Amino acid sequence: SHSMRYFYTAMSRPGRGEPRFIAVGYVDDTQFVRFDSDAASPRTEPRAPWIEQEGPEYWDRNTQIFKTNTQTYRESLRNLRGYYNQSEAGSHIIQRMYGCDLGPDGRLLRGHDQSAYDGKDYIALNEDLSSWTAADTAAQITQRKWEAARVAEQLRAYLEGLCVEWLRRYLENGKETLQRADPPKTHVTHHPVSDHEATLRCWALGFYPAEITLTWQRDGEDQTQDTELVETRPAGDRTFQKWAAVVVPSGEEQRYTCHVQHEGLPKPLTLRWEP
Amino acid sequence: IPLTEEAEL
């Protein structure tokens, strides 16, 4: 279920210069492009080896788009400041996520386009790719303008067309990394915390993509509410790490098993603490 | 590739 996503950030900074526009693109959990208008001569830069297979026109054209976006989001920030009757002295941020989910037939499974203002939902393209959900009265102004401008029709064409076509292209150009799931390396540790309790921590290291399920079971019963589960974290080499811990009564450790589900595993793993 | 052109909010 591959996907392509772009994440846009535009932040106003009155007095400290023009609004800053940042764009990053992802195929699944792999970042492949970056644009930051804060550079002296801003350019789109590669963030994955396979995107460097594109020719010079690709980079020039992406830079043109993102440079234009820098100017367009400056106007959008002014518009929203007017919608909310906000002062010209405060700093505000627009965030946006959009992209396509690839179905098994090589065509669009689901399209996405969501925006936020100051960290709160603002407007979103509905699943039919033909209508919008506005969060508040201000976003209903954007909705009316985008209904008349037919923005949903533009987005639907992109999501069903170029987004799918170029995601399939990237998946091919980098299939030796993008289409190779890396299974986690796994082990279980044991730490006493009292005379009668101990910590069982189940580790998953070096896996890709980030999607994974680590669960503890006691006599085959899920221990979700009792499990400390840290956020999946990046290793720095495009792989990820995660662990799950449970505090158990001393002497029950054999009743506890760790279950690891990941795309790179031939079969789901069942792990125990082995003294 | 990104959306080729952006509308103002």
Epitope: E57, R61, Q64, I65, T68, Q71, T72, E75, W146, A149, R150, V151, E153, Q154, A157, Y158, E160, G161, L162, W166 | I1, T4, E5, E6, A7, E8
Partner: T-cell receptor
């Protein structure tokens, strides 16, 4: 819509002339094109918004200035017979699908020796 | 050339239909084709647009036969009126900038 002045102009070779354009549609993208008789339009300069003119993208013999959001000017610095043309200004919105360009009524300009 | 309108002049009786051809060349992954008509006053009138990611355009009496692989984008005008006599231009707008590249146009004469 898009307005242009003057509608007609005759110039002697070597004279200067400034053409004026305005659009009241809240657009940002504006354009100068020229049309020689029997031909299509050819781009002179594209102004995506207010800002300083990129002189490296301005064809020889012309100066352009984006005065503000509405107003866009084109100057022939030294009129030559080859610059006899119909000069069109245009504007458009960005985003969505209704991005076709609106053309002004044009300036029909003849340069004679 | 980057936009080619091979028909220099076309005549067609009133109330019939006519197809005006247009060929283009581009390496952009995203573009629009626009059809305009020009009056003897030199006024330019927008007719119909065709996006590279869109199905065949249709707007009233105007329709576009978009053959993307062949980069052909012919305009058909049905139920012709005398007012349709004009010079018709095919224009390519590439990418974000939309710096239009025009064909040389085709003079259409509707005969009463």
């Amino acid at each position: 819509g898009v307005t242009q002045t003057p509608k007609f102009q005759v110039l002697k070779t070597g004279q200067s002339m400034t053409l004026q354009c305005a659009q009241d549609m809240n657009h940002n993208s504006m354009y100068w094109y020229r049309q020689d008789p029997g031909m299509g339009l050819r781009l002179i300069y594209y102004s995506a918004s207010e800002g300083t003119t990129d002189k490296g993208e301005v064809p020889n013999g012309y100066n352009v200035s984006r005065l503000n959001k509405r107003e866009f000017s084109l100057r022939l610095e030294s009129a030559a017979p080859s610059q006899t043309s119909v000069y069109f200004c245009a504007s458009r919105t960005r985003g969505g699908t209704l991005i076709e360009q609106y053309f002004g009524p044009g300036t029909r300009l003849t340069v004679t020796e | 050339q980057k936009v080619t309108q091979a028909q220099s002049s076309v005549s067609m009786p009133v109330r019939k239909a006519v197809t005006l051809n247009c060929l283009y060349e581009t390496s952009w992954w995203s573009y629009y084709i626009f059809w305009y008509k020009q009056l003897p006053s030199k006024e330019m009138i927008f007719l119909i647009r065709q996006g590279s990611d869109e199905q065949n355009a249709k707007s009233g009496r105007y329709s576009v036969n978009f053959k993307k692989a062949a980069k052909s984008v012919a305009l058909t005008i049905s139920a012709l009126q005398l007012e349709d006599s004009a010079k018709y231009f095919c224009a390519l707008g590439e990418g974000g900038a939309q710096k239009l590249v025009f064909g040389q146009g085709t003079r259409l004469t509707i005969n009463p």
